[PDB]
């Protein structure tokens, strides 16, 4: 369980694990949805699809190879999965028709059948997936007129005005040699991957992608999409957070574990050691909530997201939650810090030590593009054990005490009050 | 006989109440800024609900 980087001109990272039964080989680029303009939006969502299109995936299934991809902010990936005695066939699939001869994939009939399939995925997303299209509007209203707000799927009219000339224009500027990391996880040695790459002269050409005119900036705002024919209400709310390679990275994750997540229909979820659950369950204010801490290379977001069916007591759920956030500055206790230490080490252990080599290839590729090297699970555990009560109160008085918020909501949100009745709840006025 | 005493307490009350009246106009316009700049877009729904 140790990571090895070795740059011969191309960065190659690999974590061997000889108790695995499969092996993944792919390439991860360092340009995501936060490297686009508002007219070619969601053009990386058309590069994932045509890699998974039916004529391209029929060729891979004839050698026992599975394809997988993922589009986010700040990175994308294209993974090829196989059996551990067959990884040399995995490099030859990435070399042909994605790197070298990538012209036959961009036909006129293969592109037109693909675009009308991506046009119906985003249309069904906009009408059915309500807790996830509200979290998208939270990024759209907090970082407006700034790169970090464009949706990773694109929009329905930015997807329609997209021709085949736009994809090679995106690939020429972003799929370069220095903006790239080649990953391999699972049952594969580090030295058999390096020799098999330099058994040929696998490379790319130019490097030095464009340099991202406007920086990221947080703005206090709100957006309301009321729909009275939906049976619920969904609401997200956040403040500014801690970015990647920030010195308060683990301190913001420990603070969200203090309040955690909840499900009203699970019996063991109702018995958690969270002080907010005493006010929630007396009048049954919600169905579920969850606290998060997102982090990027520019900034972050710290907050929570809920879904309720009590549409006349919405303003009590917002009042009681924002009152408990005040206690991280004034009156947090030592048994709440020690409980969140144990649960954070279990949550970090199930994300970084799962059984899917496709999952560990997106995690390894991001941390080597943005830092150059990987941080161990033993070193992250040593950092979490050294947080005190003073560090949480120093972080909380800087980041959430009397600060601006961003709100987003849909459904039966008539009982949601306006901005200044919610903004004033970010300081208890008892200290 | 209260004439000279009256106009001296009328000076203190008018100075105090004019600086309270000017500050309430500033305070009101700060708390009313989010309502005056609120926007509204209408897209007609698809018609078979
Ligand atoms: C409940 C009674 C309400 C009175 C309504 C006032 C109507 C205006 C007419 C002025 C008559 C008041 C006499 C003041 C006075 O002689 O003080 C004078 C001068 O002091 C002042 O300027 C007081 C300013 C008055 C503004 C009151 C602030 C309003 C905040 C709430 C107050 C109600 C609880 C006495 O001065 P001195 O006692 O220091 O010698």
Automatic annotation (TrEMBL), chain B:
Cell location: Mitochondrion inner membrane
Source taxon at top rank: Eukaryota
Family designation: Belongs to the cytochrome c family.
Protein name, per record: quinol--cytochrome-c reductase
Gene (UniProt): CYT1
């Amino acid at each position: 369980a140790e990571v090895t980087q070795l740059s011969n001109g191309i960065v190659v990272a690999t974590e061997h694990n000889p108790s695995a039964h499969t092996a993944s080989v792919g390439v991860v680029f360092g340009s995501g949805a936060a490297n686009e303009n508002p007219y070619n939006n969601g053009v990386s969502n058309l590069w994932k699809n045509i890699f998974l299109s039916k004529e391209n995936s029929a060729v891979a299934a004839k050698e026992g190879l599975a394809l997988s991809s993922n589009i986010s902010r700040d990175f994308q990936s294209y993974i090829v999965s196989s059996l551990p005695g067959s990884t040399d066939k995995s490099l030859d699939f990435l070399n042909q028709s994605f790197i070298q001869q990538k012209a036959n994939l961009l036909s006129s009939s293969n592109f037109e059948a693909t675009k009308k399939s991506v046009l119906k995925q985003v249309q069904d997303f906009e009408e059915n997936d309500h807790p996830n299209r509200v979290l998208e509007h939270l990024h759209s209203t907090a970082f407006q007129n700034t790169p970090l707000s464009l949706p990773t799927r694109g929009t329905l009219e930015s997807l329609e005005n997209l021709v085949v000339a736009d994809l090679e224009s995106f690939a020429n500027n972003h799929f370069l040699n220095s903006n790239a990391v080649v990953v391999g996880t699972g049952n594969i040695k580090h030295e058999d991957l390096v020799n098999s790459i330099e058994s040929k002269n696998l490379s790319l050409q130019t490097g030095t992608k464009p340099v991202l005119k406007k920086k990221a900036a947080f703005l206090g705002s709100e957006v309301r999409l009321r729909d009275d024919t939906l049976p619920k209400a969904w609401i997200s709310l956040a403040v500014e957070g801690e970015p990647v390679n920030s010195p308060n990275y683990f301190v913001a994750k420990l603070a969200a574990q203090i309040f955690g997540s909840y499900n009203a229909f699970e019996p063991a979820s109702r018995l958690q050691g969270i002080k907010l659950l005493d006010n929630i369950q007396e009048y049954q204010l919600c169905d579920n909530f969850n606290h998060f801490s997102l982090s990027y290379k520019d900034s972050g977001l710290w907050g929570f997201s809920t879904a309720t069916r009590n549409v006349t007591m919405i303003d009590d759920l917002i009042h009681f939650t924002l009152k408990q956030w005040n206690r991280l500055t004034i009156s947090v206790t030592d048994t709440e810090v020690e409980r969140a230490k144990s649960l954070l080490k279990l949550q970090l252990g199930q994300l970084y030590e799962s059984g899917n080599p496709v999952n560990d290839a997106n995690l390894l590729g991001a941390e080597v593009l943005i830092k150059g090297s990987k941080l161990s699970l033993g070193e992250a555990f040593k950092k979490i054990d050294a947080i005190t009560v003073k560090d949480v109160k120093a972080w909380a008085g800087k980041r959430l005490w009397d600060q601006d918020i961003a709100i987003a909501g849909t459904g039966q949100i008539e009982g949601l009050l306006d901005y200044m009745r919610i903004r004033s709840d970010m300081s208890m006025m008892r200290w | 006989p209260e004439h000279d005493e009256r106009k001296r307490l009328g000076l203190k009350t008018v100075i105090i109440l004019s600086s309270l009246y000017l500050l309430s106009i500033w305070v009101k316009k700060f708390k009313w800024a989010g309502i005056k700049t609120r926007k509204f877009v209408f897209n007609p729904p698809k018609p078979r609900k």
